[PDB]
């Protein structure tokens, strides 16, 4: 019997219209001892909002029990602590797990778009690059668009700790060479708490 | 009870015959009651006898740690042989077996591209030189930067990322003083991977 606690998605905390949530997952619940119990706290003050999702019977004859707590955007971004407490018959003592946003002064990301290398122009597809550096903490969302429509053939690296204590990442969008050569505009969109309106975009085109 | 961890060789050690690649079997949580541990090693299921076992080390939590190292042949690892470490201890009901090998699949040659700093970044005192490596399989790779034949210090590389075609990509970022870039120095990104000729390639970047 083990307990894991998961933070909300960055995009959910940065847009007021979306619903962020903390997730508490209990694994390795035996058939002999069901009836896992959940206690949730926020800065020590107990809350009663959580919902217990239906459990799954797994392939190795165990169960996974999930509890979800909805959180306010300003609570999470202010640094409040969330504690999940799990009690089962098989456990000797209740298990406590805690999570919160990383502490420290937030730092604004710098966004740079880089066109394909000239050597890549011999291929059928080319890579468009979006470098995002200098940001803190590491919670961030990156998306690509063109003509106001989302592009989907992109992949983003995990954040990497840089030598000055900030984070950086790269996002790579793959497009057909003919779309690049015709002059279409491609945009890298970045969402982070230290940005004005939590959002900025940078464009790239051959022109 | 004891736990067993098996570690692969470092990518640079398998790619240069002058270096020595090694597989490491590490056993933790050996009790003070039953400290005797036995190792058996197999390569493709055939037992080998040239492994080197270090003396047990007492930890501050009243347990022992034991390490056994097997030196491997470069061609054996690159040909996909499987290495098994088996650990026997009287506190166990059965021996513990762990297996490791190179990732399965056909190797694919990396494409290496260097990208100069963005124009918007030239207002800064430091600039970023970018090395993109894409299309490679498997993900075991080594990336380094140098200038004028001497290694550069201030770079960081992302972990490999699985792309949409089943191959991997990564980026490496070198941070340099703007003055060094604007004076026409040559910077070079070097890459080591099994699918490259001589396991090595290099690509340069300069103002010009
Ligand atoms: C019997 O079967 C059990 C279950 O069946 C599964 O078995 C598996 C082996 C597998 O084969 C499956 O086929 C099968 O279904 C099985 O139980 C295992 O146990 C594993 C460990 O023993 C456990 O692995 C851990 O996984 C977590 C992360 O798990 C998430 O990611 C995986 C993919 O990596 C997903 O598959 C999984 O479903 C989890 O999903 C994430 O969580 C939620 C819900 O999905 C998402 O969050 C929400 O998402 C919604 C949208 O869906 C909203 O967005 C919402 O807002 C969100 O909140 C989240 O997005 C999901 N993520 C992804 C990517 O999808 C890892 O964290 C573990 O890694 C640990 O590694 C080290 C080494 O131990 C640990 O030290 C470390 O711990 C912490 O690390 C911190 C670092 O900062 C540190 O600060 C802490 O101190 C430290 N703490 C401790 C105590 O160390 C990491 O935690 C680990 O890999 C499996 O997940 C689990 N199965 C399942 C299904 O969960 C049994 O093992 C098996 N055998 C037996 C004998 O019983
Ligand atoms: C008693 O104490 C032991 C020693 O710990 C010391 O004392 C305690 C009090 C602490 O202060 C420690 O910090 C201190 O070191 C404990 O041993 C540890 O046990 C845990 C498991 O219980 C081991 O965790 C496993 O670690 C794997 C990676 O380990 C590498 O990296 C470590 C740093 O991150 C490093 O310390 C290790 O030595 C090891 O280093 C590699 O060694 C090889 C060969 O020598 C080299 O080739 C590599 O280059 C080295 N790498 C680096 C980065 O240097 C993890 O991979 C592993 O996770 C895997 O399995 C888990 C499931 O268990 C999966 O969830 C996961 O996804 C992954 O697949 C696992 O976490 C730890 O390594 C042990 N420490 C040492 C030093 O051996 C005892 O646990 C403790 N016992 C009790 C009862 O308290």
Curated annotation (Swiss-Prot), chain A:
Disulfide bonds join 24-84, 130-188. Changing residue 94 to A: Impaired ability to activate the classical complement pathway. Glycans are attached at residue 60. Residues 1-100, 109-205 form the Ig-like domain. Changing residue 197 to A: Impaired ability to activate the classical complement pathway. Residues 1-207 are annotated as: Constant (C) domain. Changing residue 92 to A: Impaired ability to activate the classical complement pathway. Changing residue 90 to K: Impaired ability to activate the classical complement pathway. Changing residue 196 to A: Impaired ability to activate the classical complement pathway. It is found in: Secreted; Cell membrane. Immunoglobulins are composed of two identical heavy chains and two identical light chains; disulfide-linked. Immunoglobulins, also known as antibodies, are membrane-bound or secreted glycoproteins produced by B lymphocytes. In the recognition phase of humoral immunity, the membrane-bound immunoglobulins serve as receptors which, upon binding of a specific antigen, trigger the clonal expansion and differentiation of B lymphocytes into immunoglobulins-secreting plasma cells. Secreted immunoglobulins mediate the effector phase of humoral immunity, which results in the elimination of bound antigens. This is Immunoglobulin gamma-1 heavy chain. It comes from Homo sapiens (Human). The lineage of its organism: Eukaryota, Metazoa, Chordata, Craniata, Vertebrata. The chain holds residues 240 to 446 of 449 of the full protein.
